[PDB]
Design a binder for these strands. Structure first.
Lengths: 95, 79, 96, 226, 107, 97, 82, 107, 95, 226
DNA sequence: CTTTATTCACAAGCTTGCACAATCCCTGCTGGACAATTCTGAGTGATGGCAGCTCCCACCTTTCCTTCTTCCTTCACTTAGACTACATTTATTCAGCATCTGTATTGTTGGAGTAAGTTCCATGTTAATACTCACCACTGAGGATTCTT
DNA sequence: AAGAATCCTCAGTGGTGAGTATTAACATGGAACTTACTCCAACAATACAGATGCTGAATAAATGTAGTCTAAGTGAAGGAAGAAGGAAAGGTGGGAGCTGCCATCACTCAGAATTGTCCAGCAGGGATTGTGCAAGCTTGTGAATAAAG
C-alpha cells in the first residue's frame, strides 16, 4: 500500500483539547481534513502572490500575516494574527 | 439512453422542500431536469478531462473534487 | 375522513427535509444519468462509488441553493408558487 | 468609531413594560452579537442575554427567561430590549455591549446604560476593597467555581460611567489599554495585576466568564488611590 | 539532544515540520523563512479549534456526544464570519439551516 | 410650450449613456470619498491618480451591472420602477449579502 | 479630515449609472440604497488595497494594489497594469 | 553559433524565450519542459489574434481605423465563448453593450 | 538610471499587423491587451501547475498546457487553441 | 450527435411568404451561429445570411436583404427563416448550417435541405468537371479574387444530399474526414488534393470563403469515378 | 355566521438491544530534528528626483429646488383552473451475495530531456521625433414625437 | 384615417493638436554549446475493486379524483416620479511651488538551503468498545371538523 498522510490525529488532539468528552465521526474528520487543506492552499497561494508582487523570493511570517489579514474576515483575522504572533514569539524565544 | 426521467417528480419536490419551496408549478420539473443536466455535463466534462490527463480509465472522487473546485463549487468530505 | 388543507403538509415536508441530511434523489437513477452523460465524453470508462457519491452531493446542494434563490424570486414577484421564470431569473443573476 | 447609543433614564410605574434602544454605529452590525447586562448596587452586574442580528438568534439567562425579550432591527441598526411585568426590584442600570461571535472575543465596547426606576459558575474575588499607593502593585484574584478554557475578561468601571474592557482571554490586552495592566492564570485561578498606579485607576474592577452558557460577573474590587 | 519537535517548541498541536515540507514542495516560493510554518500552523490550529468548539457546542445542544457533518454545517452557517470564509464551500451530509420564509406561514 | 412624455427622455438617456464609454460620476467627489474611506484604515495615505481612476472604473462598472440585475428584478415583479427591494434581491442572489 | 462625502455621489450621477444599466424609472429611495452599496464595496476594495500597500512598506497606494485587490475579490480589471 | 530564436523556429510572434523565463520564475513547477512555452505562446497568440481581429472588425464597422477599449468590449461581449472566458472581467473605458429590455419600449 | 518595464506591446502589435494591416491601436487598448495576455498566462500556468501537482509530477510539459487549455477555455476556443499549440510544437520540434 | 432537423418540400404559389425551421439538437444552441444558404441548378450555392442566437444578431447578404428575414426561438432551440414575395426564380434547396462564432470555424454541420418549389469575392475554379480512375491523385484549384487569410473551406456534396465539410481553415481536416483529402494554399491560391479515390468520391466539390462579410461559394467541380 | 369542543394525525420524548463504526494498541518506516557549512537574499543607510500634494483662478457646465402633469403602482374583486392531498396500484430500487476481469499501482532500468554555467550578440526598452486620426464647430437631412386635425 | 411644428441624432466638411507610429542607443537576457543527473516512459506482475447478474422484500413513484386557494385579469384612485426652467455652486483644466517618498545602489551579515545520521512520530492493520440507530410505547400539540351560541 502507500502511506497517505492526513490531519486526523492533529484535529483529534485539538478536539480533545477543546472538548474532552466529545468524539467525532469519520465523515466529519474528512470535512476537517478538507477544510485544513483548503485553508492551507488559500493562505499559501496568497502569501506566494504577496512574495511575487514585492520581488521577494522567500515566504516569511510577514507574508503569512498579511495573507491571513486578506482571506480571513475581521475578528477571525484578528484572533488568527494574535495566535500566529504568539506562536512565532514562543518559537523564537525557545530555540 | 434517456435516464433523465429517473430524476422523478417527487425527487425534485423533495429538493424544493429542502430549499423552502411551499408551492411548485407543473413546469418546474422539466426546467429542473435541464438545469441538472447542464450542471452535470459541466462537472463531468472537467472530471473526465482530469481522468484522461492521468492516463486513467476510472473517474475517481479526487477528479470530481478537482472539477467541482474549478468551478468555484468546493466540496468537503471526499478527501 | 380527515384531510389536511393545502400548504400544511407542504410546510411539514419543508420542516422534515430541512431537518434531515440524507440525499433526496435515489442513487441508481443518478448513477445511470452520470454514466450516460459521461458516455458522450468517453466511450468506455468506469466510475468510483465515491465519485458518483460526490457528484450526487454536489448536484443536490446546487439544486437546493437554486431552489432557495427561486423561492426568493417567487416571493419578490408576490407569489408563493415557483415558476420556470423564477429559475431563469435566479440563474441569470447568478451568472449561469 | 464604534459606539453604542442608549436612551435616557426611565421612571416607570410597576406592572407596565419598557423598551430599551441600543442604536449602533461604526461597525458591521450583523457580524457582532449585542449582550445585555443589568447592574444593581446589591447584586452587582448580571448578564441577561444576547441577540445575534445575523440570524436574530436569542439566548437568555435562566432567571431572566420570559421576563426579558430581545429584538433586532437591521434597517436602522438598532437592538431593542423589552421588560414586561416590572417588579419593584428593577431599579437598575441596563447596558448593551458589543461582542463578536468568536468565543475568544468579549464584551469589548459598552453603551452608556439606561437607569430604570420603578415607582452556574461563581467568581470569587478575594479582596473586596483594598488600598494602594501611587506606585504600588495591585493583584486581584478571580477564583472560579468550575473550569473555563481561559475565557475570562477583566473590566474597569468608574463611578457613574460605563465599564471599560481591560483584559480579554485572561492574558490579552484590549485595544487602547496600556501595558501596565497584566492578566494571568487559567483554568480556575485567574489574576489581574496593576503595575504602577495613577489617579485614573480609582475604579471598580470586575471579572466576567464566558466559557459556559450563563455568563457570570465577579463581585468587584473598589480601588482608590490617596 | 533528544530531538524535540518544532510544534512543541511553538506550543502547537499542528505540525510545523509537515507544514514546512508542504510549503517547500508545494511550489509557492524559492525559499520558506522558517517562521512562516509556525504562523501557518498556529492559524490552522486556531481555525480548527474554533470550528470544532462550535461544532461540539452544536452537538451538545443536539444532545449528541459525537460530531457529525450536520454539526459542522450548523456551526459554520450560524456564524457570519465562518459563513463568509466558506461561502462557496459545500459540506457533504451537512444539510441546510432550518429557514422558512415568513410569508409562507399561515395567517 | 412643447413637452416630452415621461419615459421618452428616459429612453433616449438609456440609448445615449449605453453608447458612451466615459465615467458617469464626477472625478473630484469620488476622489474625496475614496480618501475619506481610506483615512479610516491608515492615516496620511497618498494615492496615485491611476489608483483613484481604477477605483472609479471598478465602482462604476459594479454599480452599472447591479443596476441591470436590479432592472431584471423589477421587470420580474411586473414593474418598470426599480426599488430598494430589487437591489436587495439582486445582492442576495449574487451573494453580496 | 474629510467628512460626509458620500453625498457627493449625487442623484444625477446615480441616474446616469442607472441609464447605462438600462433603467427607465427610478424610485426616490434608490439613491440612499445605492450610496450605501457603493460605500460598502468601496470599503472592501480599499481595505484590501491598503493591506497590499502596508505589506509593501509604502505610504502611497498605487494602481497595482487596487488591481490586486480587485483580482482578489473576483472583480478583475483590465487596462490599469498587470 | 548563430540566429533562429525559438519564436521563429516555431513560427510565432509571441516570445517563447520570455514565456519560458516567466514559467521558470513564476514558481509553477520544479522543471519546465521545452514544449510548454511553445504551446503557451501559441495559445496566447491565437487568443490575441482572435480578440484583435474581432475588435478590428468592430472598429471597421464604426468608420474608425484605431482600436479603442470600446471596440474590445464590443468584440468580447458579443461572443458566447469570449464572454465566458472574460465573464468576470472589467474592461476600463469599455462601456456596456447597448441593449434595452423589450418591456421598456413604448407601444 | 531607473530599471525598465517589460510587456507584450511589441508582439501584440505584430499580431495586429498580421490580422489587420491597415488598423492602428490606442495605448489604452494596448493596456487592455497586456492585462489580457498576463491574465490568461497566469490562469493557464496555474492550472497546469495544479495538474502537475495532482499527478505527482515535477515538470510542466506541453501535455499539461494542452489539458489546462482544455479545462480553461470553452469549446471551439479550446479546440482551435489546441490546434494552434499542436501545430507550433510540431513545427518547433522539426528544426 | 449534432443534428439540424428541417421540414419537407414546400410547394408555394407566388405572392405569399414561406417559413423554414432549423430545429437543432446535440449542442449548446446559443454558442453557434445558424447560417442559411440556397442552392439552384442555375447558379449553385450562395450564402443568404446568418442569425446568432446568443444576441439574436443577424447578418444578411446584400442581394437577400428584404427578401429573407431570420428569427430565433431559444426555448424550442429553433431558427426560423421567412421568405416573402416568392418570384419565379425561388425554387431552390435551402440549407441551414451550424457555424461557430470563431472566425476560423466554418459550416461544419448542415441541414437536410428544404425544397421550395414555385408554381464581393469572385470564386474561380479552373476544372469544371474531371474524370479519374480508382487510385490516382486529383487536384482542384480555387483561385480567388481578393485576399483571404486562409479562411477557405472545402465541401463535398453527393447528388440529392447535403454538403459534407472536408477542409476548414484551408488546410485542417474536418471531424471524421480521412487523410486522403488534403487542403493547401493561402492568400488567393488554394487547392484540394485527393490522394487515392474510392467509389464514394463521385461528388461535387465546392470552396467557400468567409474572410469577408458576404460569403461566396465556388463554381463547383464534378468528380466522376471511372 | 363566531367561538369552541371533540377528533384526528404527527412529531417528539423515553426506554432498551445491538452492531457498526470509533477509539485505542502494536509495528515498522519514513520523514523530521540535530548539526556544521555554504550560500545567498534581504535588511540598513544614503541619493536623487519625481510625482503627489496644496493653493489660486476664471468659466461654465452640472446640480438643486419648484411646479405641473401623467401614468404607474397598489389595492380590492372575481374567477377559473391548476395546484395539493390522499388512496391504490405498480414498478423500481435497495442490499446482499457471487463471480470476473480490466485496471491501477508498485518495482526496475535506462535513455531521453532538462538544469546549470559562459559567452555574446541580437532583441526589446526608452528617449526623441513627425505626422495621422479623431475629436469639436458647424451646417444639414432625416426620422421620431407630441398635437390638433 | 392624417398634418405639422419641434427638439434630437446621424452625415458630412475643415482644422489641428494629442497621441501614435517611426527612428537611434544600448544593455540585458535569450540562444549556442557543453556537461551532469534525475525523471519519467516502458514493460511486468498482481491484487483489487468496479462491473454484471440474481433475487426477494422494501419503498417510493404513478395515477386518478376531489376540492381549495391562488395566480391573473380588470378597474379605479392617488401619489410619486419625470420633464422643464431658473438660479447657484462646484468641478475642471491650467499653473505654479514644495517636499515627502519611491525606486536605485551598495554593503554585509544573519538566515535559509544542503547534506548526512539517527530516531521517534505517524500511518496501516487489528482487536475493543460504546454511541446512536432502530423499534416500540406514551404524549403533548397543532390542524381541521362538527357543535352551540
Amino acid at each position: 500500500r502507500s502511506r497517505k498522510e492526513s490531519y486526523s490525529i492533529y484535529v483529534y488532539k485539538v478536539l480533545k483539547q477543546v472538548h474532552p468528552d466529545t468524539g467525532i465521526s469519520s465523515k466529519a474528520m474528512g470535512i476537517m481534513n478538507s477544510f485544513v487543506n483548503d485553508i492551507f492552499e488559500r493562505i499559501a497561494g496568497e502569501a506566494s502572490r504577496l512574495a511575487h508582487y514585492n520581488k521577494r523570493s522567500t515566504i516569511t511570517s510577514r507574508e503569512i500575516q498579511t495573507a491571513v489579514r486578506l482571506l480571513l474576515p475581521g475578528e477571525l483575522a484578528k484572533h488568527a494574527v494574535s495566535e500566529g504572533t504568539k506562536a512565532v514569539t514562543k518559537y523564537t524565544s525557545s530555540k | 439512453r434517456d435516464n433523465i426521467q429517473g430524476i422523478t417528480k417527487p425527487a425534485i419536490r423533495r429538493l424544493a422542500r429542502r430549499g423552502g419551496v411551499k408551492r411548485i408549478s407543473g413546469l418546474i420539473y422539466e426546467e429542473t431536469r435541464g438545469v441538472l443536466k447542464v450542471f452535470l455535463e459541466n462537472v463531468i466534462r472537467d472530471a473526465v478531462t482530469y481522468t484522461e490527463h492521468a492516463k486513467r480509465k476510472t473517474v475517481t472522487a479526487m477528479d470530481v473534487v478537482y472539477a467541482l473546485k474549478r468551478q468555484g463549487r468546493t466540496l468537503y468530505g471526499f478527501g | 375522513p380527515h384531510r389536511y388543507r393545502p400548504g400544511t403538509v407542504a410546510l411539514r415536508e419543508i420542516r422534515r427535509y430541512q431537518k434531515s441530511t440524507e440525499l433526496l434523489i435515489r442513487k441508481l437513477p443518478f448513477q445511470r444519468l452520470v454514466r450516460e452523460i459521461a458516455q458522450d465524453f468517453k466511450t468506455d470508462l468506469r466510475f468510483q462509488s465515491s465519485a458518483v457519491m460526490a457528484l450526487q452531493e454536489a448536484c443536490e446542494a446546487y439544486l437546493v441553493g437554486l431552489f432557495e434563490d427561486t423561492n426568493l424570486c417567487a416571493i419578490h414577484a408576490k407569489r408563493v408558487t415557483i415558476m420556470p421564470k423564477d429559475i431563469q431569473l435566479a440563474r441569470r443573476i447568478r451568472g449561469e | 468609531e464604534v459606539q453604542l447609543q442608549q436612551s435616557g433614564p426611565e421612571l416607570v410605574e410597576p406592572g407596565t413594560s419598557v423598551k430599551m434602544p441600543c442604536k449602533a454605529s461604526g461597525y458591521t452590525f450583523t457580524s457582532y452579537t449585542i449582550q445585555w447586562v443589568k447592574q444593581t448596587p446589591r447584586q452587582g452586574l448580571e448578564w441577561i442575554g444576547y441577540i445575534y442580528p445575523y440570524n436574530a438568534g436569542t439566548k437568555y439567562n435562566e432567571k431572566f427567561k420570559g421576563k426579558a425579550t430581545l429584538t433586532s432591527d437591521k434597517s436602522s441598526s438598532t437592538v431593542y430590549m423589552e421588560l414586561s411585568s416590572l417588579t419593584s426590584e428593577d431599579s437598575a442600570v441596563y447596558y448593551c455591549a458589543r461582542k463578536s461571535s468568536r468565543l475568544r472575543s468579549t464584551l469589548d465596547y459598552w453603551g452608556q446604560g439606561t437607569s430604570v426606576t420603578v415607582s452556574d459558575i461563581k467568581m470569587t474575588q478575594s479582596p473586596s476593597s483594598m488600598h494602594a499607593s501611587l506606585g504600588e502593585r495591585v493583584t486581584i484574584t478571580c477564583k472560579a467555581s468550575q473550569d473555563i478554557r481561559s475565557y475570562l475578561s477583566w473590566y474597569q468601571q468608574k463611578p457613574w460611567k460605563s465599564p471599560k474592557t481591560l483584559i480579554y482571554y485572561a492574558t490579552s490586552l484590549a485595544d487602547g489599554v496600556p501595558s501596565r495592566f497584566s492578566g494571568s492564570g487559567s483554568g480556575q485561578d485567574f489574576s489581574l495585576t496593576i503595575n504602577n498606579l495613577e489617579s485614573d485607576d480609582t475604579a471598580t474592577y470586575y471579572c466576567l466568564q464566558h466559557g459556559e452558557s450563563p455568563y457570570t460577573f465577579g463581585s468587584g474590587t473598589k480601588l482608590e488611590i490617596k | 539532544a533528544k530531538a524535540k519537535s518544532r510544534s512543541s517548541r511553538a506550543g502547537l498541536q499542528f505540525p510545523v515540520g509537515r507544514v514546512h515540507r508542504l510549503l517547500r514542495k508545494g511550489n509557492y516560493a524559492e525559499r520558506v523563512g522558517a517562521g512562516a510554518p509556525v504562523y501557518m500552523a498556529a492559524v490552522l490550529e486556531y481555525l480548527t479549534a474554533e470550528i470544532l468548539e462550535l461544532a461540539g457546542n452544536a452537538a451538545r445542544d443536539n444532545k449528541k456526544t459525537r460530531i457529525i457533518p450536520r454539526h459542522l454545517q450548523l456551526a459554520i452557517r450560524n456564524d457570519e464570519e465562518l459563513n463568509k470564509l466558506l461561502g462557496k464551500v459545500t459540506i457533504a451530509q451537512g444539510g441546510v439551516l432550518p429557514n422558512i420564509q415568513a410569508v409562507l406561514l399561515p395567517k
